[PDB]
């Protein structure tokens, strides 16, 4: 009867941004009391929904992604934003409903000398369509001579780690983000009363 | 080998508009981050634009708004369209494969871009 | 905006000796450093990526060091190839800044 929205947000590992996950949230009560009463928010962007009202709301289902990028990032995580993030990683729609969360989390994701297992996409020939997730690890090819596997001249990793440490600046550090999409045929997920 | 040949610089009344043109050889310029890079006259380099791999486009502030980053795939070249200039832009302009918006490991001979009337 | 600030600003020591370019900067940008030599009427050519790593083509003579707020160039073994304008850029945050340049001078 409980939405789980606790193992999202208060999971004790988060994604790498490029292989972002999903919960799927059915057939459930959900309260919201617990997020926008928060103080723990650094940013509460609603795009089209009221998080306030999201106790007198039924939808069909409603979606939470989560995953790390840094601070000068959490801007990208808007409809039409362009970046690496967006365009690479995780995009969202111009039509986007739904709220992006974002908190600082240096504690638990900033390791002294680096943490090194939060990556991002770093090459890609074309932008991610949105809410699109691309775990492709071949080798880039940023010339005309095939790559077969191997980096080299011409031949990159399309991946890049973010290598939090906990002396960089706020920008530089990590930020977990969960993105809440609010989809709306019978009404699985609803509100208190 | 890499090869990065610019064209297009010259006189240009202040407000006029003009175009640098980066023809590319050893690599695929659609796959690759470039960037312009301009050196005033004993000022040092500074920043330009950017055109991702992707096709998403940044510029500087002090470019926003007047200069165009584009590239022809076709004819393997970087453009730079520069429109409403100014004295100040005067500078010799680079051109730069950008390896992922960090750095620039090749560089084009440059070209001198005067503004004055 | 982070100004990254080059010292010495020009420097001029006899070939074979070692020198050393310091390269200090606004905020801490975390070894998201990389140094250029410009050599008269020439464009800039890489030398070394990150705070550390050498650019493909370079001698091993050339070393980056630092982090952070620090960083350091040293030129060991100094041929008369060398001794152009060094310039070190930053690019752990936007929009990605060029240090003021240090000139390096043959002694004779």
């Known amino acids: 009867n409980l939405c789980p929205f606790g193992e999202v947000f208060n999971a004790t590992r988060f994604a790498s941004v490029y292989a972002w996950n999903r919960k799927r949230i059915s057939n459930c009560v959900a309260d919201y009391s617990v997020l926008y009463n928060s103080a723990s928010f650094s940013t509460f962007k609603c795009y089209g929904v009221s998080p306030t009202k999201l106790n007198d709301l039924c939808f069909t289902n409603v979606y939470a992604d989560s995953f790390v990028i840094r601070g000068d990032e959490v801007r990208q995580i808007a409809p039409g934003q362009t970046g690496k993030i967006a365009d690479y990683n995780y995009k969202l729609p111009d039509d986007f409903t739904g709220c992006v969360i974002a908190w600082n989390s240096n504690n638990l994701d900033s390791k002294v000398g680096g943490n090194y297992n939060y990556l991002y996409r770093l090459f890609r020939k074309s932008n991610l369509k949105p809410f699109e997730r691309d775990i492709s690890t071949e080798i880039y090819q940023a010339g005309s001579t095939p790559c077969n596997g191997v980096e080299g001249f011409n031949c990159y990793f399309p991946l890049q780690s973010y290598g939090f440490q906990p002396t960089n600046g706020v920008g530089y550090q990590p930020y977990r983000v969960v993105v809440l999409s609010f989809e709306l045929a019978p009404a699985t997920v609803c509100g208190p009363k | 080998q890499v090869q990065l040949v610019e064209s297009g610089g010259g006189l240009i009344q202040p407000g006029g508009s003009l175009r640098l043109s980066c023809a590319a050889s050893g690599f695929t310029v659609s796959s690759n981050y470039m960037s312009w890079v301009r050196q005033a006259p004993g000022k040092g380099l500074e920043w330009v634009s950017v055109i991702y791999s992707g096709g998403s486009t940044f510029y500087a502030d002090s470019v926003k708004g007047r200069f165009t980053i584009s590239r022809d795939n076709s004819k393997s070249t970087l453009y730079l369209q520069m429109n409403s200039l100014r004295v100040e832009d005067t500078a010799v302009y680079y051109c730069?494969?950008?390896?992922?918006?960090?750095?620039?490991?090749?560089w084009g001979q440059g070209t001198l871009v005067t503004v004055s009337s | 905006e982070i100004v990254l600030t080059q010292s010495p600003g020009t420097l001029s020591l006899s070939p074979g000796e070692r020198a050393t370019l310091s390269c200090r900067a606004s905020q801490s940008v975390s070894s998201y450093l990389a140094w250029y030599q410009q050599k008269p009427g020439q464009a800039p050519r890489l030398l070394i990526y990150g705070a550390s790593s050498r650019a493909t083509g370079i001698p091993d003579r050339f070393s980056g060091s630092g982090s952070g707020t620090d960083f350091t160039l040293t030129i060991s073994r100094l041929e008369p190839e060398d001794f152009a304008v060094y310039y070190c850029?930053?690019?752990?945050?936007?929009?990605?800044?060029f240090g003021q340049g240090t000139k390096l001078e043959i002694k004779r």
């Open positions: 850029q930053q690019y752990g945050s936007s929009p990605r800044t």
């Open positions: 730069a494969r950008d390896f992922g918006d960090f750095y620039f490991d090749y």
